[PDB]
Amino acid sequence: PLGSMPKYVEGVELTQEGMHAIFARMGYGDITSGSIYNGVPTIDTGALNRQGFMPVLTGVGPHRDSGHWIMLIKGPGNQYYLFDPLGKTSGEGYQNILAAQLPMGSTLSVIPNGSGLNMGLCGYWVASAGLRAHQALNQHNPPTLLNVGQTITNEMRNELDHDGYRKITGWLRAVADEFPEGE
Amino acid sequence: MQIFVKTLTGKTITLEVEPSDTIENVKAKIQDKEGIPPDQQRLIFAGKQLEDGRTLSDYNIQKESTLHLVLRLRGC
């Protein structure tokens, strides 16, 4: 019988230290991240505006050790955006609880990307498409929200081929920040 | 008598604690103030992770000294 129970790479999860570490390696310094803990968000909006973005660990809690990374993005003016690699509906799940933490007069909109293109691969999409969405939404003449969501969806789907999976799996495996897969 | 506990999401948390007790006691104080159970907490004072039985002046942690709290959470 095919023995050796197999450690699959879709179960590599990023720690808080790992997320900070990924942003540091990319060059954003010692950033402050956010979270939603037992249903109450901690998001430092000063640091958000200073950084231009903030990763937010949702779905964690007293008993929930694993959860869901998303990206909070600050746009031009008082517009903030929520990027969820799982798609528009999932992010709309957090729209409200995150909106109540932003400055008075703010609006928080979810990037309308499609679900089903994530494939259980964590962190890479928030730490890649989120930053690219930030830059897209903050240029002089930004495309509409629909257009950014469309391009983000197409990019995740096209990067879905073998080569892309190999590149992602190399990155995920290179994450010596032991959130086990059973390890 | 007052020590600060700062976190990766930006927060400072004042904790009143006559420096003479134990690290599990600081963990209990943080659990009360923010609801995070003690077993999801790693406490680091001045590049040193803190052992439970070890006491607060074992680690020379004085008043106004600041401890960093990292949570044993992770997400997909």
Residue numbers in the entry:
A (entry chain B): -3 to 179
B (entry chain C): 1 to 76
Give the article text.
While the SdeA DUB, an effector protein from the arsenal of Legionella pneumophila, reacted with the Ub cysteine in the expected manner showing Ub binding at the S1 site, the effector DUB from Orientia tsutsugamushi preferentially reacted with a noncatalytic cysteine. A difference electron-density (F o − F c) map calculated after the MR search showed residual electron density extending from the DUB catalytic cysteine, which we interpreted to correspond to the disulfide bond linking the cysteine residue of UbG76C. The free carboxylate at Cys76 points towards the catalytic histidine, much like the same group of Ub in the product-bound complex. The Cα atom of Cys76 of the UbG76C mutant closely overlaps with the same atom of Gly76 in the Ub product-bound structure, with the free carboxylates pointing down in the same direction towards the catalytic histidine, as alluded to previously. The thiol group of UbG76C points up towards the empty space in the active-site cavity, which appears to pull the DUB catalytic cysteine away from its preferred position as observed in the Ub-VME-bound structure. The alanine side chain of the SdeA DUB Cys118Ala mutant (the Ub product-bound complex was crystallized with the SdeA DUB catalytic cysteine mutated to alanine) also points in the same direction as the cysteine in the Ub-VME-bound structure. The movement of the catalytic cysteine by ∼4.6 Å (Cβ–Cβ distance) to engage with the cysteine of Ub in a disulfide bond induces a local conformational rearrangement, which seems to be necessary, partly due to having a substituent on the Cα atom of residue 76 and partly due to the aforementioned relocation of the DUB catalytic cysteine. The active-site cysteine in the disulfide-linked structure adopts an unproductive orientation which lies beyond an interacting distance from the catalytic histidine (Sγ–Nδ distance of 7.7 Å).
Last but not least are erasers, or deubiquitin­ases (DUBs), that remove Ub from ubiquitinated proteins or trim and disassemble polyubiquitin chains, regulating the signal. Here, we explored disulfide-bridge formation as a strategy for producing a stable DUB–Ub complex amenable to crystallization. To this end, the Gly76-to-Cys mutant of Ub (UbG76C) was tested for its ability to form a disulfide bond with the catalytic cysteine of a group of DUBs. Using this approach, two disulfide-linked ubiquitin-bound complexes were crystallized, one involving the Legionella pneumophila effector SdeA DUB and the other involving the Orientia effector OtDUB.
